[PDB]
Amino acid sequence: AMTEYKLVVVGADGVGKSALTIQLIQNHFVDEYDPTIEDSYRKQVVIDGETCLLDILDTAGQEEYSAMRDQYMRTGEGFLCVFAINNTKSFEDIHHYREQIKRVKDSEDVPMVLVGNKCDLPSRTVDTKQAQDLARSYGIPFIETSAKTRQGVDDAFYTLVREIRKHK
């Protein structure tokens, strides 16, 4: 009975939710052949010596009804809250995603990691001082990633699993 961790990836349209997940699951950067519909994926990985299974919901179609999203938001054990470092509006949306997760989990204590994706781009508009101050106000880790180069991707998911391990 290998430990299973249920993870959910949330964030504004276009921040790279699918790109982060597809690098971990399929070892490539998202292209026109990868599907765009919301789905869950499974992956066996070794994190700090523990062989475990990750079950990841990649959210999409945010305005439409989804029975899977309804189930997995309630059972999710940890959430990656993603913004893009070149899109201030996506960073401004983070607090709304976090407030919704707390509302649906009916708890003030939910494992989460703040992810600033697209860190390969020169056009940064969200400074790390602003993002780190937000993560510190929530008591959660902050990591910057590039799903394109894969920088930080595996570490973002492993960091979230480390936060889930502290919940219990």
Binding site: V10, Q62, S66, R69, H96, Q100, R103, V104
Partner: peptide, 13 residues
């Protein structure tokens, strides 16, 4: 906005 549509979230209702 939600931001996600979740059927049992009171804000979505």
């Amino acid at each position: 906005a939600x931001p996600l549509y979740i059927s049992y979230d009171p804000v979505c209702r």
